[PDB]
From a paper:
We solved the crystal structure of a novel type of c-ring isolated from Bacillus pseudofirmus OF4 at 2.5 Å, revealing a cylinder with a tridecameric stoichiometry, a central pore, and an overall shape that is distinct from those reported thus far. In contrast with the distinctly hour-glass shape of the c11, K10, and c15 rotor rings, this c13 ring resembles a “tulip beer glass” appearance, in which the only slightly curved periplasmic side transitions at about the depth of the ion-binding site into a more significantly flared cytoplasmic side. While the inner helices are remarkably straight and only slightly tilted by ∼5° toward the c-ring axis (as seen from the periplasm), the outer helices are more curved and have a kink in the middle of the helix at the key carboxylate residue (Glu54). The more relaxed positioning of the helices in the alkaliphile ring is caused by the structural impact of the alanine motif AxAxAxA that replaces the glycine motif GxGxGxG most often found in the first helix coding region of c-subunits. On the outer helices of the c13 ring from an alkaliphile, two prolines located one helix turn below and above the ion-binding glutamate can be identified in a motif (PxxExxP) in which the first proline, Pro51, is specific for alkaliphiles. Within the groove of two neighboring c-subunits, the conserved glutamate of the outer helix shares the proton with a bound water molecule which itself is coordinated by three other amino acids of outer helices. One of these belongs to the side chain carboxyl oxygen (Oε2) of Glu54, whereas the three others originate from the backbone carbonyls of Leu52 and Ala53 and from the backbone nitrogen of Val56. However, several lines of evidence indicate the density seen in the binding pocket of this c13 ring should be interpreted as water rather than Na+. In contrast to other rotor ring structures, no residues from the inner helices contribute to ion coordination in the c13 ring. Although none of the inner helices contributes to ion binding and the glutamate has no other hydrogen bonding partner than the water oxygen, the site remains in a stable, ion-locked conformation that represents the functional state present at the c-ring/membrane interface during rotation.
Author numbering:
A (entry chain D), B (entry chain E), C (entry chain F), D (entry chain G), E (entry chain H), F (entry chain I), ...: 1 to 69
The structure:
């Protein structure tokens, strides 16, 4: 039950984080394609946004380990 | 049952928080691409919107922990 | 059952709240990118809309805590 | 089964009400962007539509409370 | 089972009624935005349409109460 | 089992009836917006199509009552 | 088991019939809007098409009652 | 199990057949609006396609009745 | 288990078959509408494709009957 | 367990196969509509693609029978 | 359990393999239609891509068999 | 439980790997069609992306085997 | 439950990572096709984005092995 729990928590967090980053990274690739001169502005948005999007997935991962220990 | 509960809360919280942020960050990246001159305005919307979107997912994380402890 | 229940309520409230805020903030970012003069106008709608969209999710959070305590 | 029932009613009602509101608010933001002279008219539609959309979710919340108490 | 049933009936009715109302209201807002002269005509379609969409969700709320009591 | 059954039939009937009506009403709001001279004509199709779409959801509500009583 | 079965059969039949009708009535409303002189023509296609789409859902409703009785 | 099986078979057959016919009728309505001259030609394709689409659902309904009786 | 099995095989076969045919017929209708002079040619693709698409659903139907009997 | 297994393998194989073929056939019909001179070319792509798309669904059918027998 | 296991690996691998191939082949057909001069190069892409898409679906099929045997 | 596990690992790995490869191969085909001068550029992108996308599904396949042995 | 747990974590991790990488690689390909000069800029974004998006999926894989061993 602890195993199932930890797995569901880890599993959903993986999906959460991976898709979220992918959406953001795509956005900056498309924007950069549209406006090469905004490369740096766009990249900084990516670097701010990724951590924000991974925050709760990371927490859920931690909880996943707490369930396992 | 406590493990499963906590996993579900954290897992769904992860999905909610991560995707929400991505939608918002993407919108911001796109907007800034269309209108570089609006950078700051759009970044303010991001910084306001992100916390607002995280609020309930964060509360569900607190509940996930209350279930575990 | 109480743990499982508390989780289902909080988890679903997280999704509901996070996604609804994303949709509203994204529309606000988009409206503003399109018509920068309506920046304040669109901001006011975001500030009215968000509490409205969070209302039921927040009540579900309370019910979650009630199920738990 | 009461906890599970309460949660299910409350969580679904939260998804229902939050997303319904997001859709209505997003329409209002899009409409006001295109036709700013109509902001009042549209805001009235939003203030009518929102309560209408929240009606069954709230009754489900009330049912969630009856299941608990 | 009475609790689980009542909650399933009420949860689904809320999803049904709220989303359906949102869709209709959105349409009315988009329509009124394109053709402001039609605002009353469109509003009458909303007021006729909303009760029709809510009809069966309301019946299912009654059934939810009949199962609960 | 009766309770669970009645709720599944009522809840699915609600989703069915509410969404279909919404689809049909949206379409008549959009059409009326594009071709206001067709107001009456389109309203007639709405009034024909709504009962038709509600037919089977209503039989299922009846079956829902038969399971409860 | 009979109750569950009757509910599943009737609930799936309601979704089926209601959505199918909705798709056809919508197509009819859109078509009529684009070509008002084909009102009768298209209305005939609706009246042929609806019974065809409703056919199996109605059989499933018969099976629902056979299961209930 | 027989009841639940007959129900799954008939309910899936209803979803399959109603949606399938709706897709085909819609195409026929859209085609006729686009190129009204082909009314009869498209109607023939509809009359050929509807029975073909309905074939496996109807067999599944028969299997439903075999499971029941 | 036999009953449940036969119903899953048959119901899934029905959805596969009916929707596959609809997609192909829809395409043939759209094709014919755009290029009336290819009527015969597009029809022949339809008569080749339906049997091909229906091939595995039909086997699934045989397996459903093997399970029953 | 063997009946439920055989039904799952077969019913999934049916959805896999039917839908894959429908997607390929539709693409052939659309291509032939747009470029009638490529008829034979596109038809050969269809005849290579369909067996390939069905290879795994077909193996899943064999495995389904191995489970029954 | 062995049976149910083999069925899930096989049906999943069937869905994965068929749909992937359908997407790749549809791409080849659409591209060949737009730029027939690239028939050979697009066909090489497809003959490289299809096996790569099938790699893990085929391994999963091997596992399904180890589970059975 | 082992069989079931192994099957969930391998079937999800199959879906994951297959669809991902299809998305990438499709993108390669569509781009080469728009810009045949870049067929080698695009193909190098494809040969880099594919192994990356398969990394985790391949590992997950290893795990599936560990579970089974 | 350890087996089932490890499989859920590894399988969800595979879907997460595969799709995220694919979305990103697709974006890179589309951008490179639209703007061949940015080839290297876009490729760097891809080499930053991929490791990022696979981070949490990799942690879930690690967790999958913990659960197993
Ligand atoms: C458990 C299932 C996991 C996978 C669920 C689906 C994964 C894919 C999610 C991403 C889908 C949406 O993409 P996107 O980049 O926002 O497109 C934006 C397109 N524009 C450029 C026009 C804005
Ligand atoms: C349980 C697993 C759940 C997986 C959830 C995955 C959901 C991903 C949804 C992301 C897609 C939405 O993207 P977005 O930025 O709103 O743009 C959409 C509108 N435009 C393209 C025009 C901008
Ligand atoms: C476990 C289940 C998780 C569910 C996750 C579902 C994610 C849904 C995300 C929805 C994102 C899209 O929103 P939106 O901007 O209103 O549409 C865009 C419309 N425009 C084309 C006008 C821009
Ligand atoms: C279990 C949790 C489920 C969460 C599901 C969330 C889904 C939210 C999707 C809502 C999408 C709302 O976009 P829409 O009204 O089509 O925009 C159309 C705007 N234009 C008319 C300008 C194009
Ligand atoms: C259990 C979770 C349930 C969540 C379900 C969410 C469903 C939301 C679907 C409704 C999305 C919008 O649709 P609509 O406004 O009719 O069309 C869009 C209008 N245009 C055609 C002009 C773009
Ligand atoms: C239990 C959860 C059930 C949720 C079910 C929600 C279903 C909502 C989808 C129905 C709204 C769709 O609107 P529509 O008029 O077809 O526009 C679609 C956009 N076009 C007109 C361009 C096609
Ligand atoms: C549990 C069941 C939940 C209910 C599921 C709801 C499904 C709703 C799907 C209904 C979608 C409406 O399609 P349609 O109007 O034929 O397309 C119109 C396309 N054009 C307007 C661009 C031509
Ligand atoms: C349990 C779920 C039951 C409800 C499922 C609803 C499925 C709706 C399927 C789609 C219904 C209508 O789209 P369609 O006729 O394919 O044309 C769309 C493409 N065109 C715009 C070119 C015409
Ligand atoms: C009951 C549970 C299972 C229900 C499954 C129902 C699924 C029905 C979905 C049928 C949709 C098929 O649309 P179509 O004609 O290929 O057009 C698609 C054209 N575009 C891709 C360009 C939009
Ligand atoms: C039990 C589960 C059953 C699920 C059944 C779902 C079936 C839905 C399949 C729908 C596939 C539709 O794709 P398509 O028409 O090839 O794309 C058309 C795109 N263009 C027109 C732009 C080329
Ligand atoms: C449980 C089993 C359910 C299986 C249901 C699988 C349904 C898969 C349907 C997937 C069809 C996707 O088509 P596609 O190639 O992306 O075309 C998109 C056309 N354009 C790129 C031009 C826009
Ligand atoms: C059991 C679950 C089975 C799920 C099967 C999922 C089907 C695969 C996903 C659907 C196909 C996604 O096509 P894509 O090339 O990414 O976007 C479209 C490319 N354009 C930019 C041209 C629009
Ligand atoms: C077991 C269930 C597994 C389901 C996995 C299904 C995954 C489907 C992934 C398909 C997502 C494709 O999004 P994307 O590449 O951003 O297209 C964006 C194209 N535009 C920019 C034109 C919008
Ligand atoms: Na973008
Ligand atoms: Na945007
Ligand atoms: Na918007
Ligand atoms: Na509208
Ligand atoms: Na319409
Ligand atoms: Na239409
Ligand atoms: Na059509
Ligand atoms: Na077509
Ligand atoms: Na592409
Ligand atoms: Na892109």
């Amino acid at each position: 039950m602890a195993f199932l729990g930890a797995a569901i928590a880890a599993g959903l967090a993986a999906v959460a984080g991976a898709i979220a980053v992918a959406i953001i990274v795509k956005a900056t690739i498309e924007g950069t394609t549209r406006q090469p001169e905004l490369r740096g502005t766009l990249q900084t948005l990516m670097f701010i946004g990724v951590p924000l999007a991974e925050a709760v997935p990371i927490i859920a991962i931690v909880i996943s380990l707490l369930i396992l220990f």
